[PDB]
Each structure stands twice: as structure tokens, then as C-alpha cells.
């Protein structure tokens, strides 16, 4: 996860003074430091998502939406329905 350049951050506004994290325990940056490490970035933002993770989520949601739409018909296509759910775990197992 700690690669040479991913998740480093650049701060536009230079200023004196210590910028402490939300909880008060980590010093994010001070003394006109303008480039954050990946570790400091993750603490500043608090949440993160990887694009490759977002894509499995995105695939699973599409497969799921399709199985819901092709469902309302039969709720009134097995291989479709089961084809849709199979593709859904295939993504979910990859989350």
C-alpha cells in the first residue's frame, strides 16, 4: 500500500503554525511543510477508496440492478437471474 508516489498530498496554502489531526494526537504538518506523506494523507482524509475496489463495487451493483429488473418480470429467465447473481458474487468475493 505504501508505494513511492500514491496518496502523497500537496497543500496549496503555506502558513506558519502546527496543523494537528482531528483527535489532537497526530501532527499532520507544521512549519510551512507543504507535502504530506501517504500516512498523513490518510489521517487527514479519514476515509479512502481504491479505484480498483470502486470498480468491483460498481460491477456488483450493476449486476445486482440487472437482476432486480429482470426479476420483476418473473415476479409476474432463470439463467439470466442466476447469471446475474453469479457475476455479482464474482465481484463481491473480490471486495
Amino acid at each position: 500500500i505504501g508505494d513511492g508516489l500514491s496518496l502523497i498530498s500537496i497543500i496549496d496554502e503555506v502558513g506558519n503554525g502546527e496543523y494537528w489531526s482531528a483527535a489532537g494526537d497526530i501532527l499532520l504538518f507544521a512549519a510551512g511543510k507543504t507535502k504530506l506523506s501517504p500516512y498523513m494523507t490518510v489521517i487527514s482524509l479519514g476515509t479512502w477508496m481504491y479505484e480498483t475496489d470502486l470498480m468491483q463495487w460498481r460491477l456488483a451493483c450493476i449486476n445486482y440492478s440487472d437482476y432486480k429488473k429482470t426479476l420483476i418480470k418473473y415476479r409476474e429467465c432463470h439463467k439470466i437471474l442466476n447469471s446475474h447473481y453469479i457475476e455479482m458474487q464474482k465481484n463481491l468475493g473480490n471486495l
Binding site: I8, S9, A22, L36, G46, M49, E51, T52, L59
Partner: protein, 503 residues
Amino acid sequence: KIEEGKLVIWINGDKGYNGLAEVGKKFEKDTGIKVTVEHPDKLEEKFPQVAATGDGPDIIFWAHDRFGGYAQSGLLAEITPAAAFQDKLYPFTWDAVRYNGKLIAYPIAVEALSLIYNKDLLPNPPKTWEEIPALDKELKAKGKSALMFNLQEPYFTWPLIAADGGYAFKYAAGKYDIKDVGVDNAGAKAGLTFLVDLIKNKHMNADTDYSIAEAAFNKGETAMTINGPWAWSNIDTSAVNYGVTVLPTFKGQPSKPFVGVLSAGINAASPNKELAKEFLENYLLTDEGLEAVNKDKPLGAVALKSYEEELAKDPRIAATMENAQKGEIMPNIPQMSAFWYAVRTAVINAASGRQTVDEALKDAQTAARAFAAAGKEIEIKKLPEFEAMVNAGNTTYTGLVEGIGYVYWTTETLYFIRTNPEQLWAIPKYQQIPFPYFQRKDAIIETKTLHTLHVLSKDELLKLDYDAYYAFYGIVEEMLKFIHRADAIKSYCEIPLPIIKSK
């Protein structure tokens, strides 16, 4: 900025601009509206710059492929010809002027490569590529060669490569899929294999370029060339008796040249859209209209069925249309830059024997995918220069970086409270606060802008689901802002928000 009640038309200087202007005078005569025809230099690059400022012409004529970038930027009005009007034009020409499902220009004229042959040397030109080796044996014994055409530029070699299954970007229903590139499939390999063997067996030289082939044909030294209507004038001057005909088939299937469709687009900032609509539909796109342009400088084949049938009495024009109908409409997504860049190298390396057909198309497939995913601009930046940018706080570059892949930036704003506002003679101290951020008005609030760097290996970039029309990085940024805020607001306050859900 664009003057109302008047029409300003931009068309390239090599087109029949005077003829178009006289269609304008017919339009003024009937309606009182003056029509001004201009041909500024590099108008296809000036247009985006001046249209964005709500300026420029009311109508622009240009090859349809360039209009894809215009529509991406919302620079072209969405046109609305009636169903019956559309049947007056060949259906495939309308495909050239769809962008992401939207009709955004009117088709005017059609051009594609053809087979150009010397009637004296070759009364009966070959129908297949496969029979050209034998034809070259015969003509070599008489001191001639069968065929010479530009082998340096993939535009001219692609008709052969595509015939058995090559394509640039898969087309379906007004939309190109930049993830579906047909450069290293079996068809493209078969066709390029046939090209390189022609060179190995000495029927063609891999160094032959556009001026060399042109000189050879126009001097009577080779029986055939592959070229477009822009080259007829020089052949006319040379006094060679030439015919223009359907390109040879390969493996039984027709060669698939790229088709450029001259098109009329209406500026999205124009106050004169109906006037422009009336001009294009009721005066220009008629036999009498196109003829007036044609008489100035020939349009070639035209999209209007009625006038094309009259023009096609010339077999040269009939052939251009035939090759156009059998060919591939030039994709109007700007990512075509990746296709040209990658495929140019592959053909040259394979033709020269520096690379096998397999590796060269395998590499070009990969490079085309990667550059197309990275953006419109063909740039790969070396790692030290990019890192020089980062260490300077310069976050402008998005694209490929040699050795690491694709980089892009997402932006977030951080808020902090000063925990130190009354401490005596001290270094200011701050503490980050969560998303709603609302503090007492005596609190001192400080915001920072945070640009976070993202890195994708080519191989990571190729698995992502993006398209030509929406940059995937934009939605990635909005997801990161959403989750940042969804998590923060729970931290800020658990009181339910006074949300009004009506729908």
C-alpha cells in the same frame, strides 16, 4: 458576441467557398439575411477557442471527426432534421455526425481512399490483394511495378489491415468504446502479415512514402497507387490516363478505408440557429446548393442521394462512394490520437523487419488502450520531471508517467480551528474539524486545499471501467468527497438533519 440576424460561415480554404457564398446570396435574396463566408487559417483550432467565449461563426464546415471534441465541450448545437429530410442522405453519413447519441452536424460530402490505376499499363486492375504479387512479376519484366503507396502513415495502410477484422474502436449505436480496440486481433495480423510479405518479396519497399509513390505513379513507373481525391489534380496535370476504382479485397472481404464526412455544424452560442437550420436544410442541402459549391471546387462524393446519383456518372466519384460505403467511419472521439500514435509505430517496425507482426500489433494494442485511457494528449512524462513538478507543488499534470503508469489528482478542502487564539506570542496551532465545520463565531477557522496523488499501473488502468465521454477520475473524486463527508458528519453531530424528501 455573435451578431443576430446574420450568418457567418467558416469553411476551409481548399473548399468551394465562393460557390457557397453564392448560395448565401440566394439566401439573402429570398430572406433579406446576409450570409458571410470566411476561410480563416487553422479554423478547426480557432473554433474551440472562440466558441467557448460565445464568439465565432454561426456555421462551421469541417471533417466530422474533429466535431467530436467540439460536442464534448458543448460547442455544437444539437440539430433536428425531420425524418423525411434524413432519408435524403445516405444513412451511414448520419452515423458520422452522431456524438454520444446526439445528431450534432449535417453531413455534406464523403471521402475515402481508392485504388488509382494506370489504364495504359493496366486496363483491368486486380480485384484482390492476393493477385498483386503475380501482377508485379509480369510488370517487372516490362520494366514497371504493380503498386506503390505511402507505407509510413497508418491512414494509408489501414484499409488492408482492417479488411479481415481490424478496427480502431468498436462502434455501436452512436457510441465508441475506447476499451474495445481491434489492433492485435487475428484479422489485423492477417492483413499486416500480407503487407510485410509484399515487402519481403520485393513487390514494395518499406521506405516508400507519400511523395515517392506520388512521383512514381505520376511518371508512369508503377501501375497502381492508393490515394484520395485530393491527389487527382496532380495526376490530371501529369497527363497519365488513370482510373479510380474499388480497393482490392483481402481474404475475400473488402478493404476498409477510413471515411471522412465533411459536415456542417451549428455553433451552440449562435443566436441564429433556425436561420442556420433554414440555410442548411433548404438551400445548401439541395441539388442546386451542392452544385454551386461543387462548381467552385469539387466536393467529391456527397451525402445527398439525389445529387450523388448525378455526380456518380463519373466513375471516380462512384468508386469513392463505394469505398466509403465499404469502409469505416473515422471515429470522432479525440482518443483517436492514441490509435494513430500506436499503430504508426507497429506498421513501420513490422514493415522494416525490426519487429514481428505479432509483437508489433500486441504492443500497439497495449499502447493504444493505455494512451486512450490516459486522455486526448499523447504525452508520456519522465519520472524525474514529474517529481520535479510534485516537489514544486505543481499539480496540473494528468496522464501517463514513464515507469509508474497513469497519475491523476483528487482535491479535498480541510478545515481547522485555532486552539491557540489568545496564547501569548506563540506559534499558531490548529486542529482539524469534521465536515459541517460549524463553530461559534468567535472561533478562528482556517482552510487548506489538499491535492492527493493517484497512481495506476497501465495494467490497473486497463481493468478500470471508463468511457470516452466522461473521465472516470471525476466520479472517483465525487465518491471520495462523499465518503469523507458521510464519515465526518457522524463525527460532527448525531442530530438528524432537517431533510425534506419529496418525490
